[PDB]
Coordinates of N, CA, C and O in Angstrom, one line a residue:
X1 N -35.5 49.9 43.6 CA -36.6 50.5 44.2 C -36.4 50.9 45.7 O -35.4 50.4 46.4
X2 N -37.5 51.9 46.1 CA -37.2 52.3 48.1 C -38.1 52.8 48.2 O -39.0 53.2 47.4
X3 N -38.0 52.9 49.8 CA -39.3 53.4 50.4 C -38.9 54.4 51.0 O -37.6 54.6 51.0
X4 N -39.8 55.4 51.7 CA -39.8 56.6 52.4 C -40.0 56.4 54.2 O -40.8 55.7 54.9
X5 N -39.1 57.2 54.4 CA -39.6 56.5 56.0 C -40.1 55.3 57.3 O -39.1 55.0 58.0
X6 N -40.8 55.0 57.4 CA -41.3 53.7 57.9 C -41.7 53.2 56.4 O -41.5 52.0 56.3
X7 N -42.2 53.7 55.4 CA -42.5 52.3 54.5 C -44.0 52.3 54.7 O -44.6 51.4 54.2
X8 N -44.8 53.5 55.6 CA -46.4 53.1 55.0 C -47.1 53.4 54.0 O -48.3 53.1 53.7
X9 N -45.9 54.4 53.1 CA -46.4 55.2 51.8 C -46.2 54.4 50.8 O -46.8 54.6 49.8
X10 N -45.3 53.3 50.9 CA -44.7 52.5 49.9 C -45.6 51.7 49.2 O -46.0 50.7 49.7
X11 N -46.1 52.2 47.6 CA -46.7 51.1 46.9 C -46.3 50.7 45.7 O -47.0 50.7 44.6
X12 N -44.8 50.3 45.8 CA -44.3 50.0 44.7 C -44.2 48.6 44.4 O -44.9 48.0 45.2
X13 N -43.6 47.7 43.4 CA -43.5 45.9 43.3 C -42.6 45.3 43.8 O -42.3 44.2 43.3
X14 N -42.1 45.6 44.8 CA -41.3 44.8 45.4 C -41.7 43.4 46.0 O -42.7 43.6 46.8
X15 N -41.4 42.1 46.0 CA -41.8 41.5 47.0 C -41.0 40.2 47.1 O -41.4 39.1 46.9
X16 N -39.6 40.7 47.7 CA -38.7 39.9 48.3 C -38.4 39.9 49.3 O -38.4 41.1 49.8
X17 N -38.1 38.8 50.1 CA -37.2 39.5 52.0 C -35.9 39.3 51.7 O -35.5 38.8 50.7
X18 N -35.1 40.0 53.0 CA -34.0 40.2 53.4 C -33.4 39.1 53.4 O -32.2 39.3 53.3
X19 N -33.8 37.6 53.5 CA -33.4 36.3 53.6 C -33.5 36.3 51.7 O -32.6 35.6 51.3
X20 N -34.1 36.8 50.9 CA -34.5 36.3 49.7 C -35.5 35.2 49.2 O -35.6 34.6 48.2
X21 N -36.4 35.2 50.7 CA -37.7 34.5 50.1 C -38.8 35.0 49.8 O -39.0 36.0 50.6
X22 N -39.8 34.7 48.9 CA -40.7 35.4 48.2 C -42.1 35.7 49.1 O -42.6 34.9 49.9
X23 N -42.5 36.9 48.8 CA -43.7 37.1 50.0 C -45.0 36.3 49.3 O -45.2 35.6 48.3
X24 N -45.8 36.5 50.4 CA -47.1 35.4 50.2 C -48.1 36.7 49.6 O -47.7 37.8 49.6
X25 N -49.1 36.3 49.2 CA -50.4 36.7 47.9 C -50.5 37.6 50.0 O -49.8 37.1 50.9
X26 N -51.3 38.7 50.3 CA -51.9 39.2 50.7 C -53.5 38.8 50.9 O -54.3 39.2 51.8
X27 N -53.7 38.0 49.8 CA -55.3 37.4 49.9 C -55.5 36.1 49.5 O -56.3 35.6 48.7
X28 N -54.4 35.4 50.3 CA -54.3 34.2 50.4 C -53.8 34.3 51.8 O -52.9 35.1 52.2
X29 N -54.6 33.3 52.5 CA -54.3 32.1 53.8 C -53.3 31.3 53.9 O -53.1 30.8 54.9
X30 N -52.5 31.1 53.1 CA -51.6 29.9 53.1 C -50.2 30.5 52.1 O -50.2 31.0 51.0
X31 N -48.9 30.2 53.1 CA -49.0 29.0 54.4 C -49.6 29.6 55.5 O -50.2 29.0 56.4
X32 N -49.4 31.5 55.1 CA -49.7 31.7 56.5 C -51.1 32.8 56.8 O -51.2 33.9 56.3
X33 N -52.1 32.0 58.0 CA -53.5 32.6 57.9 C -53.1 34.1 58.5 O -52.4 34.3 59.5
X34 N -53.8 35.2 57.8 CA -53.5 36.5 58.6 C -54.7 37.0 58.5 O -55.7 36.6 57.9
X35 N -54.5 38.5 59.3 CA -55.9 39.4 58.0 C -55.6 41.0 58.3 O -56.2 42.0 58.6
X36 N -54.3 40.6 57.9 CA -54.0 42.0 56.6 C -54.4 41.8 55.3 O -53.8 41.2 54.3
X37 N -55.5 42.2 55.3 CA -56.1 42.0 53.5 C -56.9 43.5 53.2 O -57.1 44.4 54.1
X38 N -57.2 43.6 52.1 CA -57.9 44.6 51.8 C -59.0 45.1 51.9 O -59.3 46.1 51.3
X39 N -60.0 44.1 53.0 CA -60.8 44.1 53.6 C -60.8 45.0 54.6 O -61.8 45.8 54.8
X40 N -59.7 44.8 55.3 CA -59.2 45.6 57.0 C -58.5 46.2 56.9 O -58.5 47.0 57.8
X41 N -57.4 46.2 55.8 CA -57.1 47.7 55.2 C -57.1 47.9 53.9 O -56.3 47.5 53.0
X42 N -58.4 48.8 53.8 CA -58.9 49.0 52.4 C -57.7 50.4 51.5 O -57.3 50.5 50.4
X43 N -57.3 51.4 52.7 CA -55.8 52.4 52.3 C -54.6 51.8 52.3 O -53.5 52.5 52.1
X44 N -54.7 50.4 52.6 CA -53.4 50.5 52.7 C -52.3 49.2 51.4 O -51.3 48.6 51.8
X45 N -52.9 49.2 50.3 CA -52.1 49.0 49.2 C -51.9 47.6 49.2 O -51.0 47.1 48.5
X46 N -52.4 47.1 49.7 CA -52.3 45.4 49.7 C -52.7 44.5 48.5 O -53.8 44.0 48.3
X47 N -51.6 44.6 48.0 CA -52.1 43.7 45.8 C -51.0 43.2 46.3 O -50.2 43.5 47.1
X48 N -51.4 42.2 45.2 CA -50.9 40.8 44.9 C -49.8 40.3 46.0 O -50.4 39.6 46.8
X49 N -48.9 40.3 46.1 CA -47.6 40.0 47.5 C -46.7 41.0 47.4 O -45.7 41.1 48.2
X50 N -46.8 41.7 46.7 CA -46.0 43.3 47.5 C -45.4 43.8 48.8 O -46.1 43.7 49.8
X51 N -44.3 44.1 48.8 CA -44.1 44.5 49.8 C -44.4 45.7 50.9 O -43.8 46.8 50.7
X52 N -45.2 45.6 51.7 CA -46.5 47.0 52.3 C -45.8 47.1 54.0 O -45.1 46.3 54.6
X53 N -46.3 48.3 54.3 CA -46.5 48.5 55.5 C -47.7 49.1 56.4 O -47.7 49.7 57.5
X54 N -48.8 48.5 55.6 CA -50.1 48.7 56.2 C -50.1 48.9 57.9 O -51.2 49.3 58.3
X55 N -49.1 48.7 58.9 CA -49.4 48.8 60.0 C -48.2 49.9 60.5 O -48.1 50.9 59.8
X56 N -47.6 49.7 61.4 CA -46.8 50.8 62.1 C -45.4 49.8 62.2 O -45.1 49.6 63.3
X57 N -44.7 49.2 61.2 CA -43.6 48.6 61.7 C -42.5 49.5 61.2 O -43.1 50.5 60.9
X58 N -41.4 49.6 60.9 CA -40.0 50.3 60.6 C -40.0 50.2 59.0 O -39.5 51.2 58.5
X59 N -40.3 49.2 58.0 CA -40.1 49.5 57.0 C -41.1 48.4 56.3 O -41.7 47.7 57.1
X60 N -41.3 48.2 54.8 CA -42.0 47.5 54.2 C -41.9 46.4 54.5 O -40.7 46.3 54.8
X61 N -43.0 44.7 54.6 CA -42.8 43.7 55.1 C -43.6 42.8 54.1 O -44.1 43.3 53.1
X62 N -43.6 41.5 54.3 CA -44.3 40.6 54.1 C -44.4 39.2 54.5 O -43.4 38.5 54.7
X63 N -45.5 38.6 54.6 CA -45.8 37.2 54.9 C -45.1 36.3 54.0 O -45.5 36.2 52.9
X64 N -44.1 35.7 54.2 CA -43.4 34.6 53.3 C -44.0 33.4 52.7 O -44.8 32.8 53.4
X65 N -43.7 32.9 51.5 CA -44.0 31.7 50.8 C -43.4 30.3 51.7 O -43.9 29.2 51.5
X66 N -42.3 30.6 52.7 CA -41.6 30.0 53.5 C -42.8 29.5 54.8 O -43.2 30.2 55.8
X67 N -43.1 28.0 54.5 CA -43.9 27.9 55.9 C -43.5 28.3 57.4 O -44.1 28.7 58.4
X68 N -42.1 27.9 57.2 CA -40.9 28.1 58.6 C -41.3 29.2 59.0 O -41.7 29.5 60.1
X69 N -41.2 30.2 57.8 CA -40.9 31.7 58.1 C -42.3 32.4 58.1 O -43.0 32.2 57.1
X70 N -42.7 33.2 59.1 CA -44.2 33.7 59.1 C -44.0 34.9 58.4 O -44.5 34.9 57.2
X71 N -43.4 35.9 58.6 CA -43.1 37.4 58.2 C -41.8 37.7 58.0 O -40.8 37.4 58.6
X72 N -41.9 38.5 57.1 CA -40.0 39.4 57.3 C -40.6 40.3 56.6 O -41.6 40.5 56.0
X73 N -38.8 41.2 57.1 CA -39.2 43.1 56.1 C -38.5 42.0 55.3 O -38.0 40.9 55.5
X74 N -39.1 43.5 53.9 CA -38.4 43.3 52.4 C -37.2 43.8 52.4 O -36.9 44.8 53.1
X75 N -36.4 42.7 51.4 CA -35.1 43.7 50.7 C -35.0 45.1 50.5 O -34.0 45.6 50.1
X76 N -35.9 45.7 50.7 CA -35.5 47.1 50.5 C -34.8 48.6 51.6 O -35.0 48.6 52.8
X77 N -34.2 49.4 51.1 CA -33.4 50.4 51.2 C -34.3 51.6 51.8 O -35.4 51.6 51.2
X78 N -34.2 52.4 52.5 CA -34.8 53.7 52.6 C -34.0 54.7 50.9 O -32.8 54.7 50.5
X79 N -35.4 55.6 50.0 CA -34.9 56.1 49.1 C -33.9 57.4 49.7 O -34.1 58.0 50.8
X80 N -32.7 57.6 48.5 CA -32.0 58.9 49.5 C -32.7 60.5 49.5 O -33.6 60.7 48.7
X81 N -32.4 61.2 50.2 CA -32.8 62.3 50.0 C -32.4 62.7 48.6 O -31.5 62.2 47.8
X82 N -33.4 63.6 48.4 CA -33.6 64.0 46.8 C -32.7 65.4 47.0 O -32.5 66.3 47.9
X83 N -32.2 64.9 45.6 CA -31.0 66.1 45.9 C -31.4 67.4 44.7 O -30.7 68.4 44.8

């Protein structure tokens, strides 16, 4: 799978980081409390722990299952140009 650009169009199932740890539920608090939820952004694709770019960062991210770790981008690739 890949994303386009920064990654705010991205609503595909990805939801691993770059480290290989698993992202957190989006509407879950724990480990870590946020509020990117679908409340505060209702456009911007926030299911289940997917990997999203609801804000303006460089590529798709997420809150980790890792208490240590608050956030990381995901494993993923920018897609190539379509040829």
């Amino acid at each position: 799978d890949c994303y386009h650009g920064d990654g705010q169009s991205y609503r595909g199932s990805f939801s691993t980081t770059v480290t290989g740890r698993t992202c957190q539920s989006w509407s879950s608090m724990t480990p870590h409390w946020h509020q990117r939820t679908t409340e505060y952004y209702p456009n911007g694709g926030l299911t289940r722990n997917y990997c999203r770019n609801p804000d303006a960062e460089i590529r798709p991210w997420c809150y980790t299952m890792d208490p240590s770790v608050r956030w990381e981008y995901c494993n993923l690739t920018q897609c190539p140009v379509m040829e």
